[PDB]
RNA sequence: UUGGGCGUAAAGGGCUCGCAGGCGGUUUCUUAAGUCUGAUGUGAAAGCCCCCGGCUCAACCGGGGAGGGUCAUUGGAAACUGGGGAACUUGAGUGCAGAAGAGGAGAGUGGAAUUCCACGUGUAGCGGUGAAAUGCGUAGAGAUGUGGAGGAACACCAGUGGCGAAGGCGACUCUCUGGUCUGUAACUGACGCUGAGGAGCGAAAGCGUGGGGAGCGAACAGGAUUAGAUACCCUGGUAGUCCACGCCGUAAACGAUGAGUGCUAAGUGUUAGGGGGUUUCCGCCCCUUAGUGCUGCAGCUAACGCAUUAAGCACUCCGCCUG
RNA sequence: GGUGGUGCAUGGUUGUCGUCAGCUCGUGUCGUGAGAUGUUGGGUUAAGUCCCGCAACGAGCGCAACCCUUGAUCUUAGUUG
């Protein structure tokens, strides 16, 4: 769609004043207007994500709302670019080498799972990786074959990640975000002002970046 | 924005402050090292290090300055207007001088400006002695710096009338 | 209250004696010349460098064993040398002696050599500092699992002694599978005593 | 001043009313005291500064300039600060209709208690502390049921509620009396702010005179604890605590934040209102002033933290600080 | 030659808190700085033992185990038993 699906607004009236301060007679909600303002917004970042895609740079998503984490990981498989799924760990990108250093023990452990050595402690060793293996991997997540830091970032909810935008800020790296009632335009390099809670609205537009960026890619 | 690691910097170590630790088995020392770190041609900040030994402290130190750089405009190799930094109670004045005058200014501040290049220039200090709070506030005031075509494209004019 | 000598711990389940002989009535003038024996190497060929020496005894002929490459060297132009010296030991065990040299590769991490290298650079006027950080990485880049290095004694600062230590590594003392090799040396300097005290990580044993 | 500060580091007067003084809403004519700018007359010489000349550079010595007035006369300009004249209404007041209140002074009134007294019943202890003891009781206590006598304070309502400039102000009624907020637009048309000295208020203790004295209770006595205990604890208890009129003029008199004015994100209670949308039912919501709290941006902050009730951004006036 | 002084000139040794469960660093973050985080919060055990969250992610020395010895038994060996 262009049409509105689930963009309508927030559950509460207790919110950030950012740009909602001279907005004429609407709802209940003042911002009607926002069902429009979106489109070419959500349009500007489309042309983004094509240039990102044409450039060949990696975007990823990252996400621990309660209702997004799925989405987001089979919209970011089958786009083909990152993501993150659980707890959004500190410092990842400020401490890349760190991360790196510590997946590549990931990845010695599937080498010695599947042709290494799997027979030293017939109940010890097994019993103790496992479990190694499943932990790590399920905080990590779709982060494991980075080799280079992202081009762009893509946040769906600014507020929950604080440390997200906060590290991205550093490192100066371009930053998208879907943005609730109740988030902070201030910092985001582009606005796509939707409501974090419409578990339909979140999936049909990231949805919607994901075949921008497959497109753009041919 | 952050400037890339493609120039030549120096390192001046302006301090190394003893720093001391209280615990149960009686005091646990440290050293914690702040430099100033930069090209010539205009590029400085600074950087701090705290660690057991002196010279990986100042290691410490200097990545960290290179990581976190600044830019300055250079106007015939000196400021181009008054400015008063203000971080802090560091409060220190910068006059542009004419071309031969030099640099006269404290310590910390003769370093961080002479890194910075400017041959010619004058300034007081008149908040704490304090150095790191000494190089906080100049370097705010730095920053605050504007050349005077930014200026004028601000305004939608021209350098002629503006500085006629 | 300080730790216990990690070979002094290890000897006999992960170490040998380097003293293979068995005796029964002469156990107390064995052992006394064997100290004797080791004494005189020591000192005569200190300069040449040996790390440990190990004594064997058949049909009452004592024979050795004597370790690093230096005295390779020594088997060369020293081997004229080396019967010299032996001749020496023939005389002082009354009963002629065998000996063998053995090559200690990549000497960085023998304890005892590692100690005598911290002693000589201490004793010709070398700062603690730079000695102790450059053998460190030196043997780490040798090819050790962890190193910690000790040095003591009125250091620098004449009025006071102090204790330092540098180290990298992973270094497990109260494992009893490891193969923590320790050796300790005495350096006499213008301004007091300094001793050290290093030992290395090489690895576990199965 | 150029060139600092006053919440906790030194520093906001205890509070208020106000003489002098310092400051001054909008428009419009006029006056040129302030103001800005020419002309003239001086601001000696020698010095500092500039440019030249000379002692074999100069030290120095010359020659010529320039600067040096909160300066006198005179001319020119009128934007701003003053002066005068004519407007205007937002500031400031008056009138009109409501609303609230422990606001103040005076008179009277009432309820539960504590104590004392007399009376009935009433036996053996009551009271008290970490244990105890001093005390009160067979001259009949305490307890318990009556009736009086008195003096002090007004339980729940009562709420980071309300009022007051501050101290402070709570039972009820009445007499007198102060200030505030709301809506108006009918009136005057800048009548305003601040305020050294000055004047008045100014808790509690304290003092003077005359009453009053239930309880509490400095002092003081007795009993405990302690090595000692001039105290902490217990039993008493004088002065005071109360009333009328004077006096003192202090408090951590604190929000440790002077008064006035304007501007600068929000959210959220609560007090007294006003308007509107569904009903002129209730109660649902939206605006809206004035208070009175709580979180929280920018901003400030040395940190705490303050943040439309600024400790932010600014202007006037006063007071205060300089180890 | 000093069993002569100086353990407040030292090495090298040893006791003690204490076999207590703590003590630290790499990198990164927050603070301006002393600094904090990790090392806190839920339970858990003997434990900084483990798991769960958490601007932290890891690592090191400690704890555990790897060692000795006593507890049941299989194979080999039967002399001086």
């Not at chain 2, 181009?80 to 006269?104: D, M, Q």
Request: hydrophobic share 40%; with cysteine.
């Amino acid at each position: 769609l262009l049409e509105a699906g689930v963009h309508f607004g927030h559950q509460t009236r207790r919110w950030n004043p950012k740009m909602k301060r001279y907005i004429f007679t609407e709802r209940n909600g003042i911002y009607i207007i926002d069902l429009q303002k979106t489109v070419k917004k959500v349009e500007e970042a489309y042309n983004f994500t094509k240039n990102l895609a044409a450039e060949g740079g990696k975007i990823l998503f990252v996400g621990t709302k309660k209702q997004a984490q799925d989405s987001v990981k089979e919209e970011a498989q089958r786009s083909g670019m990152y993501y993150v799924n659980q707890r959004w760990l500190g410092g990842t990108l400020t401490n890349f080498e760190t991360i790196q250093k510590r997946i590549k023990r990931l990845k010695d452990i599937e080498k010695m799972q599947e042709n290494g050595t799997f027979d030293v402690l017939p109940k010890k060793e097994v019993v103790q990786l496992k479990k190694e293996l499943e932990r790590l991997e399920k905080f990590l997540g779709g982060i494991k074959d980075m080799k280079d830091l992202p081009d762009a970032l893509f946040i769906i909810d600014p507020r929950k990640e604080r440390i997200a935008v906060a590290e991205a800020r550093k490192l100066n790296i371009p930053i998208i975000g879907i943005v609730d009632t109740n988030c902070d335009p201030d910092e985001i390099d582009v606005v796509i002002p939707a409501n974090d809670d419409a578990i339909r609205a979140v999936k049909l537009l990231t949805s919607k970046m994901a075949d921008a960026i497959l497109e753009a890619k041919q | 924005r952050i400037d890339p690691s493609k120039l030549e910097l120096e390192e001046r170590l302006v301090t190394v402050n003893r720093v001391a630790k209280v615990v149960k088995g009686g005091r646990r020392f440290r050293f914690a090292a702040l430099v100033v770190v930069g090209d010539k041609n205009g590029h400085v900040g600074f950087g701090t290090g705290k660690a057991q030994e002196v010279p990986e402290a100042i290691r410490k130190a200097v990545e960290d300055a290179k990581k976190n750089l600044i830019e300055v405009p250079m106007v015939g190799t000196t400021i181009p207007h008054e400015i008063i930094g203000r971080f802090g109670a560091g409060n220190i004045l910068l006059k542009p001088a004419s071309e031969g005058t030099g640099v006269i200014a404290g310590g910390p501040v003769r370093a961080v400006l002479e890194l910075a290049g400017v041959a010619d220039i004058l300034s007081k200090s008149l908040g704490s002695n304090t150095p790191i709070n000494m190089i906080r506030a100049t370097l705010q005031g730095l920053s605050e710096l504007k050349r005077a075509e930014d200026v004028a494209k601000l305004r939608g004019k021209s350098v002629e009338e503006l500085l006629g | 209250g300080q730790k216990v000598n990690p070979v002094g711990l290890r000897i006999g389940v992960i170490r040998d004696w380097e003293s293979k002989w068995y005796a029964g009535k002469d156990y107390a003038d064995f052992l006394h010349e064997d100290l004797k024996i080791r004494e005189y190497i020591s000192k005569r060929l200190s300069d040449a460098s040996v790390s440990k020496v190990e004594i064997e005894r058949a049909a009452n002929r004592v024979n050795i064993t004597i370790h690093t490459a230096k005295p390779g060297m020594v088997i060369g132009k020293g081997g004229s040398e080396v019967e010299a010296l032996r001749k020496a030991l023939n005389s002082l065990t009354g009963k002629r002696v065998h000996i063998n040299i053995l090559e200690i590769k990549r000497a960085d991490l023998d304890a005892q050599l590692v100690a005598d290298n911290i002693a000589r650079q201490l004793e010709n006027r070398v700062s603690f500092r730079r000695a102790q950080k450059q053998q460190i990485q030196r043997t780490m880049r040798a090819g050790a699992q962890g190193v910690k290095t000790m040095v003591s004694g009125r250091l620098g600062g004449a009025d006071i002694a102090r204790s330092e230590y540098y180290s990298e590594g992973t270094v497990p003392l109260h494992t009893l599978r490891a193969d923590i090799d320790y050796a300790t040396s005495e350096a006499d300097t213008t301004y007091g005593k300094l001793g050290v005290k290093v030992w290395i990580y090489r690895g576990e044993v199965l």
